Design a protein around this nucleic acid. Structure first.
Ligand code: GDP
Ligand code: MG
Lengths: 158, 68, 65, 234, 199, 172
RNA sequence: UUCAUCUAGACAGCCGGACGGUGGCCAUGGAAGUCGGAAUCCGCUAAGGAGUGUGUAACAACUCACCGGCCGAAUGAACUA
């Protein structure tokens, strides 16, 4: 047999998120109901957070996994309450994430990065945090990056 | 603005005053249809029996005299 | 025809076979044509052409700045 | 008057001046003192992800690219201008897109890695054809028959002028789908490829050629000698 | 100027002539059915909201001219979060006294479950008052209503419970079936109009 | 006001001081400025309490205090602030931190008011008034949409009582 | 006339590269640099915009901003008469 890989972006926890997979599923002949059920089952950890889903199709199967992404991990570490599309809109991500949680996200995202140092991976995660608009250690993430460059902040793992 | 209302750079995507529900929407549309039909009958009493029918035969009223 | 029928026709049948080349050659000739218009137009049309050229140059310099 | 008018673009990136070349010069001349082995690598038509993977694999070492003339000037053009003894041979052996690998690891390990490193790559012009490609008759699909048409998506209609004019392929638009009257042979296996055929293969997404780094020679700091490696120079 | 250019290309719809409205979820076969029964050039593509505006076709049944209207898809959302593209279909259904055909896909290749389609039908139920209603099950070449699950059959029976709708099966590759459903819709519309005019 | 003379000068901010407010128990003066900052002051000494409150990206528009009758005894009232960026931030001054950042508005928030039933009302330039709950992690309970333009101001029936706190007209 | 670039490579041309976090956040039926609103960062580089345009329903694909290879000697811009 051969392994087919599909990648998508979906809101975690929402069943029936395989509607946009119809051109992909069609020639493959799978069941969109079961595909969406498996996607929600694999994305049960993230509730109301957009995450990357990898679908493996081999023979007649459908396996769902969550690819870790910088934005999704930062939003998860932000620990926002779950939101509904009927009630909440235009929500800003301006919570607080500690530097230890940022370093944990950098450890999770280190494997698929070309940064030779965990300091470099952490600086990338802090750039993503600056993009999403949150605060790290009650300061600007770019200020944290400047502190790392100047030597005030030392990344533990070397 | 007009640019946001309509055109290549429009940003309006939902009605400004959305209907409360489909029942109110259908009641409003039925009332509007009834008013439109009554108005059409009221103008068909006079204007359609007058000006509209004359152009079918090509008849035109004579020029108004300047003595008036 | 209804709605965006010309765009649908372009999507379903394409354009004329020499459309891209002809448009590229016309846009290439545009500089010569502008110079010839500036040197050939007389009277009110020439004055208006010079005025519009000045306004376009001012707008371009402001955009660059 | 009567001169060409330069196109003006409003972008974010400026051109690099002499300061970038001087920085590369200083970095090369400092790496010469820092490290022990200096390897010459030929990396023509390398992809940036492949180069970054090579840089990641060679952690603890340095890989420096840039202008060949600048690198040769940093290494010393002649015997009276060389930065270190017997560096003119290493400078003169450079060619094309040349990378300098400053390292301290074992020569056998470096040779083993560069002999066993291989990646799939697009088939470049002036190279032997890796396969025989024939676009099948009928509706043209994105892969062009490499995968089954039931799985494949039809070729987008916006590419039809490109295939008709740049690729010189007789194509027509039927109901928004690109169609050909007869099967079109693109390349025959065991034939030198040109720019048009390489572009056709790249457009259809066939990556059958193999990219291997070429290793010219290396210089040893303490030995003050240069030895030819002759790896992937076939 | 922009409004003039757009409004010059709007299709001509007579709100007082014989009309067959086609409605339902996206990717169910509305445009395909319009292509089957008319000569309109509406696009048929396997993604949602290929059709962003009303499309009109015409045909002749019993020496009479009928117009068929293809509408953009409708989602199961309240009117407050409903958008303009759906509002076109909603206004067409509310205004055009006609024969409405609600299309359902049982294979769920449209991306919407049978429960969601039944819910959407029951949500747009107040729209078609004093209009002919028919429920057309499309893509019967993939899966038939006969070999459906028991709970889904109960949902279909719940749809059929609403008076005075009729459930008919069709496939857009079945010329005979699309002609039969078109003729049945025309018969219902003609019966309603003649009964209204007779009073 | 007894001698009509200046008593203290507060010179912490860098830009225009857009709004000033007094704590309902009369203990701390809050100043929200044009530089997206809020500063707390002891009035008896004319001094600044710690560092400024930061987190807003645009200038502060209005300030409101938690009602004393809702504040538990032994605790200090919290401070809600609205700003041009469209967010309402809640600050606990005991730890000098920020608890909640309501962000439902799509335009500049004109005013924020903290009612006596544990609710907050925000009027903004997006023609909407948002009703939030302090007891539900700062969630938007309701959205009121009836205006065709920017809502400039809002007021409550018990606003005078909420502002006055436990004091009366006799100054007891 | 005054500024600049230049055999550790002048202007044009051709070819190659144009990366990774990442499909950055909000919003949308859909919006992945390129319908919109605000940020516009970090890493690896020789260089590569959270993107100059074409293009897609969204992707894809092309392009140029920039860098490199071939070519080898002058060239560009703004003013004045
Ligand atoms: N097998 C099958 N496929 C259909 C049928 N009707 C429509 N389709 C498919 O459904 C896809 C989209 O349908 P479409 O006509 O656009 O439905 P609409 O979105 O409601 O207008 C197309 O790719 C068709 O191939 C049918 O009767 N049988
Ligand atoms: Mg359609």
């Amino acid at each position: 047999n051969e392994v087919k890989y599909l990648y998508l972006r979906a809101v975690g926890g929402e069943v029936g998120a395989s509607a946009a997979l119809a051109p992909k599923i069609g020639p493959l002949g799978l069941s969109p109901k079961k595909v969406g059920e498996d996607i929600a089952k694999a994305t049960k950890e993230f509730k109301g957070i957009k995450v990357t889903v990898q679908l493996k199709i081999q023979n007649r199967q459908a396996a769902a996994s969550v690819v870790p992404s910088a934005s999704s991990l930062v939003i998860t570490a932000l620990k926002e309450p779950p939101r509904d599309r009927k009630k909440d809109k235009n929500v800003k991500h301006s919570g607080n994430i500690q530097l230890d949680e940022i370093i944990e996200i950098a450890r999770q995202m280190r494997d698929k990065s070309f940064g030779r140092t965990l300091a470099s991976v952490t600086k990338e995660i802090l750039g993503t945090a600056q993009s999403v608009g949150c605060r790290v250690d009650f300061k600007n993430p770019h200020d944290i990056i400047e502190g790392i460059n100047a030597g005030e902040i030392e990344i533990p793992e070397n | 603005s007009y640019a946001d209302a309509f055109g290549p750079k429009a940003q309006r995507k939902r009605p400004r005053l959305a209907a409360s529900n489909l029942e109110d929407l259908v009641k409003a549309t039925n009332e509007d249809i009834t008013k439109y039909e009554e108005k059409q009958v009221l103008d068909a009493t006079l204007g359609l029996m007058g000006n509209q029918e004359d152009k079918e035969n090509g008849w035109t009223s004579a020029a108004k005299e300047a003595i008036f | 025809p209804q709605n965006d029928y010309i765009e649908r026709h372009i999507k379903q049948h394409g354009k004329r076979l020499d459309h891209e080349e002809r448009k590229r050659k016309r846009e290439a000739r545009e500089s010569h044509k502008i110079s010839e218009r500036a040197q050939k137009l007389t009277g009110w049309k020439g004055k208006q052409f010079a005025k519009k050229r000045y306004a376009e140059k001012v707008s371009m310099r402001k955009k660059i700045k | 008057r009567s001169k060409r008018s330069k196109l003006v673009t409003l972008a974010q990136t400026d051109k690099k001046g002499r300061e970038n070349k001087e920085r590369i010069f200083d970095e090369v001349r400092e790496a010469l003192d820092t490290y022990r082995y200096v390897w010459v690598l030929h990396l023509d038509d390398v992809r940036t992800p492949v180069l970054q993977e090579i840089r990641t694999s060679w952690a603890g070492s340095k890989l420096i690219m840039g202008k060949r003339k600048v690198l040769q000037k940093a290494l010393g053009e002649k015997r009276e201008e060389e930065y270190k003894e017997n560096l003119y041979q290493l400078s003169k052996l450079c060619s094309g897109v040349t990378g300098l690998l400053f390292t301290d690891e074992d020569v056998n390990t470096v040779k083993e890695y560069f002999k066993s490193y291989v990646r799939s790559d697009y088939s470049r012009p002036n190279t032997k054809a890796p396969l025989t490609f024939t676009i099948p008759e009928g509706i043209v699909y994105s892969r062009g028959g490499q995968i089954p048409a039931e799985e494949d998506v039809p070729m987008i209609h916006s590419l039809e002028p490109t295939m008709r004019n740049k690729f010189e392929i007789p194509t027509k638009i039927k109901a928004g789908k690109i169609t050909i009257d007869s099967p079109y042979l693109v390349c025959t296996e065991g034939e030198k490829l040109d720019v048009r055929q390489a572009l056709i293969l790249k457009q259809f997404g066939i990556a059958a050629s193999e990219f291997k780094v070429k290793v010219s020679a290396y210089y040893d700091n303490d030995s003050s000698t240069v030895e030819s490696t002759n790896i992937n120079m076939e | 100027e922009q409004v003039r250019q757009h409004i010059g290309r709007l299709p001509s719809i007579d709100p007082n002539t014989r009309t067959l409205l086609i409605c339902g979820y996206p990717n169910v076969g509305k445009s395909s059915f319009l292509r089957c029964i008319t000569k309109s050039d509406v696009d048929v593509q396997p993604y949602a909201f290929t059709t962003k505006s009303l499309y009109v076709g015409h045909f002749d049944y019993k020496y009479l001219r009928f117009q068929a209207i293809d509408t953009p898809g409708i989602l199961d959302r309240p009117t407050e979060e409903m958008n303009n593209i759906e509002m076109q279909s909603i206004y067409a259904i509310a205004h055009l006294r006609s024969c409405v055909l609600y299309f359902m896909d049982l294979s769920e290749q449209c991306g919407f479950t049978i429960e969601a389609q039944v819910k959407l039908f029951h949500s747009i139920k107040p729209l078609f008052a004093n209009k002919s209603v028919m429920v057309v099950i499309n893509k019967t070449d993939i899966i038939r209503p006969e070999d459906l699950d028991e709970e889904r059959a109960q949902l279909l029976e719940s749809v059929k419970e609403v008076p005075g709708v009729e459930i008919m099966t069709s496939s857009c590759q079945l010329e005979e079936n699309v002609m039969e459903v078109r003729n049945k819709a025309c018969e219902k519309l003609l019966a309603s109009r003649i009964e209204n005019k007779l009073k | 006001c007894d001698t009509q003379t200046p008593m203290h000068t507060l010179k912490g901010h860098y830009n225009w001081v857009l709004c000033v407010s007094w704590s309902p128990d009369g203990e701390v003066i809050a100043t929200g400025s044009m530089d997206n900052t809020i500063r707390l002051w002891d009035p008896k000494s004319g001094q600044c309490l710690g560092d400024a409150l930061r987190g807003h990206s645009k200038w502060i528009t209005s300030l409101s205090w938690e009602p004393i009758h809702l504040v538990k005894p032994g605790s200090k009232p919290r401070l809600a602030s609205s700003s041009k960026d469209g967010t309402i931030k809640i600050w606990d001054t005991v730890s000098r931190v920020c608890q909640y950042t309501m962000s439902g508005h799509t335009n500049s928030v004109s005013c924020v008011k903290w009612g006596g039933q544990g609710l907050l009302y925000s009027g903004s330039h997006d023609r909407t008034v948002r009703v939030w709950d302090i007891n539900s992690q700062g969630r938007c309970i309701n959205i009121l949409k009836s205006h065709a333009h920017w809502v400039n101001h809002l007021s409550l029936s018990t606003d005078y009582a909420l502002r006055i706190g436990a004091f009366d007209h006799t100054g007891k």
